[PDB]
Design an enzyme around this catalytic site. Structure first.
Site, PDB file in Angstrom:
ATOM      1  N   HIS A  93       0.833  -1.206   0.000  1.00  0.00           N
ATOM      2  CA  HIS A  93       0.000   0.000   0.000  1.00  0.00           C
ATOM      3  C   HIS A  93       0.866   1.254   0.000  1.00  0.00           C
ATOM      4  O   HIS A  93       1.939   1.279   0.612  1.00  0.00           O
ATOM      5  CB  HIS A  93      -0.965   0.032   1.192  1.00  0.00           C
ATOM      6  N   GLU A 163      -2.918   2.049  -7.697  1.00  0.00           N
ATOM      7  CA  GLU A 163      -3.068   3.281  -6.933  1.00  0.00           C
ATOM      8  C   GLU A 163      -2.497   4.452  -7.738  1.00  0.00           C
ATOM      9  O   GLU A 163      -1.281   4.542  -7.915  1.00  0.00           O
ATOM     10  CB  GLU A 163      -2.353   3.172  -5.581  1.00  0.00           C
ATOM     11  N   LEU A 226     -10.207  -1.098  -4.126  1.00  0.00           N
ATOM     12  CA  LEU A 226      -9.792  -1.038  -2.738  1.00  0.00           C
ATOM     13  C   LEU A 226     -10.152   0.369  -2.269  1.00  0.00           C
ATOM     14  O   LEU A 226      -9.492   1.347  -2.626  1.00  0.00           O
ATOM     15  CB  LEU A 226      -8.293  -1.320  -2.588  1.00  0.00           C
ATOM     16  N   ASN A 229     -11.627   6.066   2.488  1.00  0.00           N
ATOM     17  CA  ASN A 229     -12.525   6.664   3.433  1.00  0.00           C
ATOM     18  C   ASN A 229     -14.014   6.429   3.252  1.00  0.00           C
ATOM     19  O   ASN A 229     -14.728   6.407   4.179  1.00  0.00           O
ATOM     20  CB  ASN A 229     -12.201   8.129   3.581  1.00  0.00           C
TER      21      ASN A 229
END
Lengths: 244, 243
Positions: A93, A163, A226, A229
């Site tokens: 991550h 990401e 994924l 918040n």
């Protein structure tokens, strides 16, 4: 490909907030043979979270050790996760690469430890703003994926996450994300095989909410998300619905 | 000073092994108002360990985040630990300084976060073989302690651990004592005399059933942070040495 929606709660939660959040999640009637829905609480919240979520929800942890058992104070081994029947782990991550000096080599090692212990791994990668502005997106992603991809021994059990680190003030469009996903799939093809590439789920790990979720998952090579918040909200069930 | 015996299980254990070990631990009848005994299981083992151990045993975690809540995937904030009534945290253990690049700055930030959230902190430091051979023990310990020592307001709630790294790959009890006394002097001159006489300083070198008595007897050694010997049922004998 079976859709895969994951809740990365990151470093957030109390016992009370998890109690009410899991309750609202449990109200969603979905079939776990038709989509995977995985909740990743904080390590110390795992038992609490697992007991409160119905069996239809899968669960995992947000990080795992590259070392086995031993003198690694503060670490959780893959062997320990296996013993607790922790099904999924997140590896690589952004947060860990950014704040905790996690390298491509660390990612490789963590994946191997996970696979050795029958853990399923959600592996993250992606390029920075400087890298994208220098037109190095493919170079970086290829390097990051090839750091670990050859170790995948089962293409249902490893899930990839793009990401868009570059998106800082910037926002990735579904069209842009789709092209990256397509390119990731081709790297998997070139290294692992065509059937393997067609089988592997590739998730979008940028900003996902109730508004944009459908535009993203409807892209051909985007197999889920994924979520950050937005997965701390009761409205997360509407994001799951985009995969139903 | 109240003696303080701590079990650092490090990255070790199964649900079954913890069940067996905690049961043997529970057989020891000690008074928690007179002695602190703390077990530090792996994070994912915390709930299991806490439910099995009688409340006379305090519990804690082996690491805490330098950050609060937010986008820190894989971390455990001090606020999460507080919400879960996790009483203690270990900060700056050799394993984390060695393998996970944890600095003196990380240690300070973790302590500040811990104290803000009413957690008690077990803070580790100590010098390498090279540093000891260069006669820099005191120089190294002074810098490591001063990295965080000014944050301490309640000297019952921060516990110091001397880790003789120079031995970790044989310190005599006297040699340990001499370092402990220097550490207490450093606390005296930075925090005051009352405070230095209050603070617990544990020996975090190799502790076992055979040496524990000789170590605890030393004037400035207030207990231990125990490694491998704390994974065995005979850890009760180590606790007994402080009773």
């Amino acid at each position: 490909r079976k859709y895969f929606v994951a809740a990365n709660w990151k470093c957030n939660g109390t016992l009370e907030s998890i109690k009410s959040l899991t309750n609202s999640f449990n109200n969603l009637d979905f079939d776990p043979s038709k989509l995977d829905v995985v909740v990743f609480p904080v390590s110390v919240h795992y038992d609490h979270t697992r007991k409160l979520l119905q069996s239809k929800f899968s669960t995992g942890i947000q990080n795992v050790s590259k070392f086995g058992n031993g003198s690694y104070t503060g670490e959780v081994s893959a062997e320990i996760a296996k013993d607790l029947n922790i099904e999924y782990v997140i590896i690589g991550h952004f947060d860990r690469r950014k704040y905790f000096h996690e390298t491509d080599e660390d990612v490789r090692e963590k994946l191997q430890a996970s696979l050795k212990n029958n853990l399923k791994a959600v592996v993250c990668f992606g390029e920075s703003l400087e890298q994208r502005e220098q037109n190095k997106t493919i170079e970086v992603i290829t390097k990051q994926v090839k750091a670990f991809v050859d170790l995948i021994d089962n293409f249902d059990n490893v899930i990839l996450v793009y990401e868009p680190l570059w998106a800082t003030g910037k926002t990735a469009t579904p069209e842009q994300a789709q092209l990256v996903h397509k390119e990731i799939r081709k790297i998997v093809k070139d290294t692992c095989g065509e059937k393997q590439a067609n089988q592997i789920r590739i998730l979008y790990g940028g900003s996902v909410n109730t508004e944009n979720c459908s535009s993203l998952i409807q892209q051909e090579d985007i197999d889920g998300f994924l979520v950050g918040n937005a997965s701390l909200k009761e409205s997360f069930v509407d994001i799951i619905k985009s995969a139903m």
